[PDB]
Amino acid sequence: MRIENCFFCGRPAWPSKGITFMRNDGKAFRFCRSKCHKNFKMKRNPRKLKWTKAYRKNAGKEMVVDSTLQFAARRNVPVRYNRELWQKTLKAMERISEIRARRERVFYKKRMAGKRAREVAAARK
């Protein structure tokens, strides 16, 4: 089993959640909620709607160029089973998880580092 990502919003689409739409040319869209489904059907741009990770990636609200993110990718070449290999892999999963959280904290902070100066200037005014 896999965790899918919503086409419209990118939130983790877990099993038995949302509707999939199949069009005739051969592509499938997995939607995680009725909101995303209805918005896609009424043809709004996810890149324009401000509540979508696609919009965030377009507007540079998210960390998008980083090795701890390059560590994850869709696999198309199966690898033979190895117990130690998933064990060290799971320890990795934890390591990468905490690293991603801590890098994202720093990215958010270096985005809005300058707020106090503006607030104090407005208060002086």
């Binding site: 089993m1 896999r2 965790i3 983790p12 090795s67 701890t68 560590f71 994850a72 990718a73 869709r74 696999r75 690898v79 033979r80 089973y81 190895n82 117990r83 290999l85 998933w86 060290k88 892999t89 799971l90 990795a92 999963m93 934890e94 390591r95 990468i96 998880s97 690293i99 801590r102 720093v106 580092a113 607030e119 104090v120 208060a123 002086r124």
Partner: protein
């Protein structure tokens, strides 16, 4: 193929065969087939092992990658370079000015409330 022997159902010492094993171990909707019996692995005891699939909202099969330890060590090395660089170093009159601004806003809200009152 050339060194092979024809299967014949009347032969006494045939091959065991899946029909015979399922008929011996049950029927058609009763026999349960073990799909890992033909699994050729490095260690033969690693069969019948339960595969991890999800670890806190992320996919083990998507994060699974041969030769990942070198990439991991490179990752902690980059982390080391980063804190030593300082990527992670956290950095009264203004407080009273802000307090006075908040008091002025409260007074303006009271004035607006009185204006809507009358």
């Amino acid at each position: 193929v050339k060194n092979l022997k024809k299967y014949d159902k009347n032969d006494p010492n045939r091959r065991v065969l899946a029909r015979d094993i399922e008929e011996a171990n049950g029927g058609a909707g009763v026999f349960n087939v073990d799909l890992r019996k033909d699994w050729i692995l490095e260690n033969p005891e690693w069969k019948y092992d339960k595969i991890p699939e999800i670890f806190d909202g992320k996919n083990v099969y998507d994060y699974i990658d041969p030769d990942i330890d070198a990439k991991l060590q490179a990752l902690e090395e980059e982390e080391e370079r980063l804190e030593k660089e300082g990527f992670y170093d956290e950095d009264e009159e203004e407080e009273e000015i802000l307090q006075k601004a908040e008091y002025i806003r409260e007074q303006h809200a009271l004035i607006r409330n009185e204006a809507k009152m009358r």
